[PDB]
Design a protein around this nucleic acid. Structure first.
Ligand SMILES: [Mg+2]
Ligand SMILES: [Mg+2]
Ligand SMILES: [Mg+2]
Ligand SMILES: [Mg+2]
Ligand SMILES: [Mg+2]
Ligand SMILES: [Mg+2]
Ligand SMILES: [Mg+2]
Ligand SMILES: [Mg+2]
Ligand SMILES: [Mg+2]
Ligand SMILES: [Mg+2]
Ligand SMILES: [Mg+2]
Ligand SMILES: [Mg+2]
Ligand SMILES: [Mg+2]
Ligand SMILES: [Mg+2]
Ligand SMILES: [Mg+2]
Ligand SMILES: [Mg+2]
Ligand SMILES: [Mg+2]
Ligand SMILES: [Mg+2]
Ligand SMILES: [Mg+2]
Ligand SMILES: [Mg+2]
Lengths: 117, 76, 51, 136, 177
RNA sequence: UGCCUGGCGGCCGUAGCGCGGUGGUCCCACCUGACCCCAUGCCGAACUCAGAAGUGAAACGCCGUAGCGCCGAUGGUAGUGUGGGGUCUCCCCAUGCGAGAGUAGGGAACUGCCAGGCAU
RNA sequence: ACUUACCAACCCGAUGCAAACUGCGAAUACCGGAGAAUGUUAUCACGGGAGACACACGGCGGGUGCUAACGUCCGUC
RNA sequence: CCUCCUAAAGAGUAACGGAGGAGCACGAAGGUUGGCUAAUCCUGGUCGGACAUCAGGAGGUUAGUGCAAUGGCAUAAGCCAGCUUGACUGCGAGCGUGACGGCGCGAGCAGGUGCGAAAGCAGGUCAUAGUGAUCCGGUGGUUCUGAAUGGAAGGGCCAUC
C-alpha cells in the first residue's frame, strides 16, 4: 500500500466506532508543510469549526507551518473557535497518523484551551 | 467409509423481518458469519447473532462500497 | 486428556479458589494470576495448588 | 469410451430431465445430428454411433461430439434386498433434452454426412434429425 | 557519502545528456542495496546461520534479519518458520559507503577477476549479482572465518528499463564486461 | 459568482481499469536533513521529527478517449400459483406473476459542508 | 547443451454439464403492519375427561429402487 | 455430538440416502493498544536444483484461520510487538430454541481490574463439535441446623472433585 491508502486503512476502524457512538469528532490532517483541524458533526457531512496553517491569521505568527509549535497553535485555535459556538465535548480522530509529535501537540493544546476529550 | 450421520438443525435465520416492532434485546437474526452486519441500534453477539439495542422497528438495508447487508433499528 | 484440573487459591487468606486446567508436562511451573476475590472484594494474587 | 477423468463425488441423485436443450445450433462443423426426443445416452451408445459415422466417412473430414456422459448410474445386483446403501456405479450417461445437437461434421459432402448420420442414428435410443449450419 | 556526492555532481549530469530527460526526477537513482545469504544447511547445524549473520554484519555495518521459511517444501526438507537465511537492506550513507567498498576494494579482490556481467538485470533496471567467496571483503578475517560462504547482491534502482539501469551503474565505473 | 486545490461525508462501478493529454503561485506530492522526539524481528522504505535547494518524473488531481469492466430495455424464451386437460419419466390449454442469458442502447459519475489559492 | 510425425497444465476464443457450483434469479410460501366484509370465537389462557403415537391410496416436489412394484422413505394437498 | 447436501428460496423435515469430522487444544493460540497483509505466476540473482533465502513486476485473498464442513473475515476474525489477567464476582431489560430436564444470545446495572492520550474495548478463543442427568460419597469455606442443655457428630447452603 502507498502512504495515503495505508493511512486511510489505519483510520477506518476508529472512524466507524465514532460514527457508531454518534460522537462529534476533532479531525486532524497533517502534511509535511501544514497541519489542519476540523470539528465535524456526527453526520460527517458538515464542519462546525475549523483552523489550520493555510489561514493567513494563524501562519503570520509562526516560524514554520509544518512543525510542533504550529500544531499547538492550530490546536489552541480550534478549541477556542469551538467553545465560542458552544461545542465542548468531542472525540479525537488521529486520521491514521500516530498519536505523537505534531498530532499530539495539536491535541494537548486543544485540551488545554478547554476542549473535552 | 460408512455414512449415516448428521447433526441437529441449529434453527438459524431471520427471527424478526422488516418493519417488525421489537423490544431492546430481541434477536433479529441467528447466523453463522456476518451475512448481515450490525447497523444503528443493533449489536453483534459472540455467535454473530444480531439483536436490538433499542425498542423500535427492524430495518434491513444495503450500504457501503462492498454492498453489505446491514440490520438497524428505527425509532417508532 | 493429557490436561489436568488445578485450583488457583487466594493469597488473601480466604478459602476462595478459581478452578482451571494445565498441561503439567510443557508448563511445570506453578500458575500465578491476579484474580478478583469475592470475600475480600479485591483483586489479589492467586497461586496454583492440586485439585 | 467417454467418462469424466475425475469427479468431486462418486454418486449422484437420480434427478429429473425436464426442459429443452442448450446448444441447439451447428457451432463447429457444417452438419449436425440433433435430438428430437428426450432421454439418456450411455457412453457405449455414444461410442457405437461415433464408430458408425467414422467408418461411413472412411475416417475423412472432421467429427465433433457435443455431448458428454458426466452422470454416474448406479445399480443393485441380483439377490440383493432394498437399502443397505446406494448401489455401485456401473456406467455413465448424458441427459438429453429435445434440441441437443449431439454430433457435428464437416470436410465431407452433404449426401455422405446424411448417410453417416443415418447409420449413427440407428444406434441411439432417442429420435434424431439431420441439421445444417445457419447464418445466425 | 563519497559516491552519493559523485552521483549528484557527475552521474545526474551524464544520464540527463544520455537520455534527454525533461525532469531531473526521471534520472535513475540507486534506491537500495540488498545483501542476502541463503544458508539452507542451517537446519542440520543451527550455528552455521549465526556465522553467516556475523559475516553479513561485518560486510555491511548493520544487524542482519534472519529470514525464515515462507512455506514448507518436501524437496529441501524444510518446515515453515525455519531460519533458512539472513538479509540486510542498505539505504543512504551505509549503502553508498558499501557501494564504494564493493567497486574500489571488494570486487577487484575476486579470484581471476575479468569483469562482472552486464546482462544480469531483471528486465526493469534492477541489477543482481552473486559473490562466491565472502573473503573478498576486507571486513572479514581469513584466519577467523569458519567456512567459505557466498552472498547475493541486488541493486534496486528507479530506472524503468535495463538500458537505463546499465547506464546508471556504468556512470559509477562499475566493473562490467 | 467562476476556475483550481486540500479535508470530511453522501452514493457504492453509468462511479472502476486502460490508453492519450495536462497541472506546481497556492495546495498536494515526491523531495532535503536526521544527533534528537519517535521508529526498523535489518533498513529514516514505513512510522517520525527539523525543514525548503530541486521537480512535477512518479503519485495524485483534472480534461479527452468506448479496448475492457459496469449499467441495460422492448420483444421472445424458461419457470411457476390457481383451475382444466393429454399420448402423464414429460407436456398442453385458460388466467395471473414472469426470469437468466443475449440484443438495441447507456456510459469517461453525480452530490453536500468547511478551508485555502486565483480571477472578475 | 541440441532436437523430435508424441503427450501437454495455465492463458485466449468457441460449446456443454452440477444434490453437496453461483459474478443471476422467479412463481409461490412464510414473518410483520393497517383496513372492510364474512365466519354460531373459528383465537389464546387455565382447569376436568380422553383417545392416539400399525396408517392406505391418489396428485404435486424429491431421496432410494430400474423415474420397477398395489415397493420404500420424507415434504405438501 | 458437529458440518454440508437430500430439504421443495422463513423454521423444521425420513431412509442400513450421499460426503466428512468431534470426545480436544491454548496462560497465549486469551484481553487491549499500536502496527502489518496473502496464494500463485513471470524476470534477474553464490553454492541453489521444478520448489529454500534475496530483488523487481504481474496478481489481488484464489492465501490464512490449532482441526471437518459450511457461513464469515481487510475496519480484517488473518500476521507481529509492548503492556497485561475481563479465561473478572454479583446480576440482568429483552429474546432465541426446546414436550421436558435443559441449552443458547444479550445491552444495561453494582463492585473491582487490564489496555489506550482519548472516544473506547475486554464476562475467553471467527462462529457452530470437544460431552454425562440424578443418587451416593470426598475436599475447602460458611450470620444456617445441632433430638434435655453447652458442644460435637451428622445434615443444609456456597465452591469444587
Ligand atoms: Mg521523507
Ligand atoms: Mg506526471
Ligand atoms: Mg415486468
Ligand atoms: Mg429482475
Ligand atoms: Mg433481463
Ligand atoms: Mg448481464
Ligand atoms: Mg455511446
Ligand atoms: Mg473559498
Ligand atoms: Mg388445553
Ligand atoms: Mg410406538
Ligand atoms: Mg409410527
Ligand atoms: Mg406416512
Ligand atoms: Mg405402499
Ligand atoms: Mg429451509
Ligand atoms: Mg420452503
Ligand atoms: Mg486466533
Ligand atoms: Mg488495531
Ligand atoms: Mg528463477
Ligand atoms: Mg489510564
Ligand atoms: Mg444439645
Amino acid at each position: 500500500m502507498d502512504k495515503k491508502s495505508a493511512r486511510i486503512r489505519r483510520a477506518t476502524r476508529a472512524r466507524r466506532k465514532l460514527q457508531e457512538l454518534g460522537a462529534t469528532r476533532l479531525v486532524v490532517h497533517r502534511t509535511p508543510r501544514h497541519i489542519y483541524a476540523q470539528v465535524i458533526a456526527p453526520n460527517g457531512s458538515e464542519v462546525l469549526v475549523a483552523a489550520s496553517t493555510v489561514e493567513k491569521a494563524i501562519a503570520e505568527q509562526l516560524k514554520y507551518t509544518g512543525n510542533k509549535d504550529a500544531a499547538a497553535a492550530v490546536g489552541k485555535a480550534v478549541a477556542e473557535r469551538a467553545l465560542e459556538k458552544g461545542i465542548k465535548d468531542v472525540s479525537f480522530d488521529r486520521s491514521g497518523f500516530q498519536y505523537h509529535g505534531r498530532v499530539q501537540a495539536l491535541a494537548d493544546a486543544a485540551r488545554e484551551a478547554g476542549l473535552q476529550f | 467409509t460408512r455414512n449415516g450421520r448428521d447433526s441437529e438443525a441449529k434453527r438459524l435465520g431471520v427471527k424478526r423481518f422488516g418493519g417488525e416492532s421489537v423490544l431492546a434485546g430481541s434477536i433479529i437474526v441467528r447466523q453463522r458469519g456476518t451475512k448481515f452486519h450490525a447497523g444503528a441500534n443493533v449489536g453483534c453477539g459472540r455467535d454473530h447473532t444480531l439483536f436490538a439495542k433499542a425498542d423500535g422497528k427492524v430495518k434491513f438495508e444495503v450500504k457501503g462500497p462492498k454492498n453489505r447487508k446491514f440490520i438497524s433499528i428505527e425509532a417508532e | 486428556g493429557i490436561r489436568e484440573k488445578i485450583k488457583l487459591v487466594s493469597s488473601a487468606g480466604t478459602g476462595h479458589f478459581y478452578t482451571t486446567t494445565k498441561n503439567k508436562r510443557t508448563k511445570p511451573e506453578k500458575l500465578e494470576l491476579k484474580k478478583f476475590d469475592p470475600v475480600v472484594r479485591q483483586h489479589v494474587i492467586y497461586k496454583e495448588a492440586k485439585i | 469410451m467417454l467418462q469424466p477423468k475425475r469427479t468431486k463425488f462418486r454418486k449422484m441423485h437420480k434427478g429429473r430431465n425436464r426442459g429443452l436443450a442448450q446448444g441447439t445450433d451447428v457451432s463447429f462443423g457444417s452438419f449436425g445430428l440433433k435430438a428430437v426426443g428426450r432421454g439418456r445416452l450411455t457412453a457405449r451408445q455414444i461410442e457405437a454411433a461415433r464408430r458408425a459415422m467414422t467408418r461411413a466417412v472412411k475416417r475423412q473430414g472432421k467429427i465433433w461430439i457435443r455431448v458428454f456422459p458426466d452422470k454416474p448410474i448406479t445399480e443393485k445386483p441380483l439377490a440383493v434386498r432394498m437399502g443397505k446403501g446406494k448401489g455401485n456405479v456401473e456406467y455413465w450417461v448424458a441427459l438429453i433434452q429435445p434440441g441437443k445437437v449431439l454430433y457435428e461434421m464437416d470436410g465431407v459432402p452433404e449426401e455422405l454426412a446424411r448417410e453417416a448420420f443415418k447409420l449413427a442414428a440407428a444406434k441411439l435410443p432417442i429420435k434424431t434429425t439431420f441439421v445444417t449450419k445457419t447464418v445466425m | 557519502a563519497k559516491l552519493h556526492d559523485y552521483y549528484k555532481d557527475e552521474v545526474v549530469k551524464k544520464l540527463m545528456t544520455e537520455f534527454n530527460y525533461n525532469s531531473v526526477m526521471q534520472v535513475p537513482r540507486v534506491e537500495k542495496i540488498t545483501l542476502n545469504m541463503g544458508v539452507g544447511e542451517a537446519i542440520a547445524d543451527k550455528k552455521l546461520l549465526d556465522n553467516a549473520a556475523a559475516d553479513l554484519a561485518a560486510i555491511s555495518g548493520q544487524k542482519p534479519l534472519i529470514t525464515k521459511a515462507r512455506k514448507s517444501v518436501a524437496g529441501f526438507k524444510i518446515r515453515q518458520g525455519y531460519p533458512i537465511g539472513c538479509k540486510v537492506t542498505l539505504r543512504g550513507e551505509r549503502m553508498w559507503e558499501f557501494f564504494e567498498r564493493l567497486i574500489t576494494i571488494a570486487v577487484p579482490r575476486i579470484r581471476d577477476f575479468r569483469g562482472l556481467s552486464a546482462k544480469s538485470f531483471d528486465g526493469r533496471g534492477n541489477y543482481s549479482m552473486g559473490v562466491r567467496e565472502q573473503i573478498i571483503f576486507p571486513e572479514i578475517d581469513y584466519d577467523k572465518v569458519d567456512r567459505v560462504r557466498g552472498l547475493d547482491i541486488t541493486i534496486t534502482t528507479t530506472a524503468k528499463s535495463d538500458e537505463e539501469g546499465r547506464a546508471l551503474l556504468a556512470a559509477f565505473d562499475f566493473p562490467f564486461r
